[PDB]
Design a protein around this ligand. Structure first.
Ligand SMILES: [Cl-]
Length: 346
RNA sequence: UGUAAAUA
């Protein structure tokens, strides 16, 4: 019998087992649930640079088979950790040619994320040079998008310019990624970490289809990030768009969170535009804020206004709403909506 | 009364 068949059987019986014992059993150990945990635990606890080195040549020699294995990916990742800097360059060479595929596989993409998190900028660029080949598809992929986010988080803005030019590659790309469950995460990291020279065209595309993106189930988080990481002028354009279409934005499922985001990250004069629009009445119709309290989404927006605005702005809200308390008690959940605001009406 | 990611 081979070493692992023996070891899996009576594990206590082999408590005095070491990494250099494995020698050429490393592939079978790494791909094994018990064997993988032995390797991992040995690497974490060993104080012997040479035990750890002993298995490394097997790891490099079998890298393609281990990176997308359910257990083996943990063994490869151990050599991408701080403490193993001496092996980073070798291990990246072992996998560089198949990074375009590994980005898409659920286990190997974790090896790529671990490498980006730990290794130095020359090696990061080397990995990104392969991601460059598949970057659009990778951005939308359930595994690949985490790899692209990790790139944006851990690499200097200038070396993810190719990612920004992919967002900008065509007219509809940023709409396409913003309304995608995975690509929207990439747009967000970009908004958090790319330089103003890079974010300004991205935010420019977003603006062009703002309404559509704002009420998308993924796009609405993309515009929330624009509010939080964009410029004063971006916030002004958005608050102005939202103020002028307050009722439409407030009564839709997804855009209603955009108004709330404006109310949290908005300056006193932004809240003033949204409060002013809310208390402006038509000639016979009721004020927008009253209509909003009767709505399934917009009533949460009205309550966020009371939590976020100045006493003076709350005053105008209170003066606008109080003549309507009778009516608003009838409407669905109206009972609860005004109890939550009762604090303000006493 | 209302929203979002791939490992033992
Ligand atoms: Cl998969």
């Amino acid at each position: 019998d081979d070493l692992l068949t023996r070891y899996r059987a009576n594990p206590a019986m082999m408590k005095n087992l070491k990494l250099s014992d494995i020698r050429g059993a490393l592939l079978k150990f790494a791909k094994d649930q018990v064997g993988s945990r032995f390797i991992q635990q040995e690497l974490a606890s060993s104080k012997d640079r040479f035990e750890k080195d002993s298995i490394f040549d097997e790891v490099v020699s079998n890298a393609d088979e281990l990176v997308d294995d359910i257990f083996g990916n943990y063994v490869v990742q151990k050599f991408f950790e701080y403490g193993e800097e001496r092996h980073w360059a070798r291990l990246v060479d072992a996998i560089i040619d198949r990074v375009p595929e590994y980005a898409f596989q659920m286990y190997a993409c974790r090896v790529l994320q671990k490498a980006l998190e730990k290794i130095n900028e020359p090696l990061q660029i080397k990995i990104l040079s392969q991601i460059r080949h598949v970057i659009h598809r990778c951005m939308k992929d359930q595994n690949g998008n985490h790899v692209v986010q990790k790139a944006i988080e851990k690499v200097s803005p200038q070396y993810v310019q190719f990612i920004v030019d992919t967002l900008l590659e065509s007219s509809n790309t940023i709409y396409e990624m913003s309304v995608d469950p995975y690509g929207c995460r990439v747009v967000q990291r970009c908004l958090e970490h790319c330089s103003p020279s890079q974010t300004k065209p991205v935010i420019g595309q977003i603006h062009k289809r703002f309404d559509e993106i704002a009420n998308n189930q993924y796009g609405n988080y993309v515009v929330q990030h624009v509010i939080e990481h964009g410029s004063e002028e971006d916030r002004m354009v958005i608050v102005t768009r939202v103020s002028n279409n307050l009722f439409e934005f407030a009564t839709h499922k997804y855009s209603s969170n955009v108004i709330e985001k404006c109310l949290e990250q908005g300056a006193v004069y932004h809240k003033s535009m949204i409060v002013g629009a809310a208390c402006h009445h038509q000639e016979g119709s009721v004020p927008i804020v009253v209509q909003m309290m009767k709505d399934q989404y917009a009533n949460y927006v009205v309550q966020k206004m009371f939590d976020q605005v100045t006493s003076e702005q709350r005053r105008e809200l209170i003066l606008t709403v109080r003549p309507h308390i009778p009516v608003l008690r009838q409407f669905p959940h109206g009972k609860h909506i005004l109890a939550k605001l009762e604090k303000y009406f006493q």
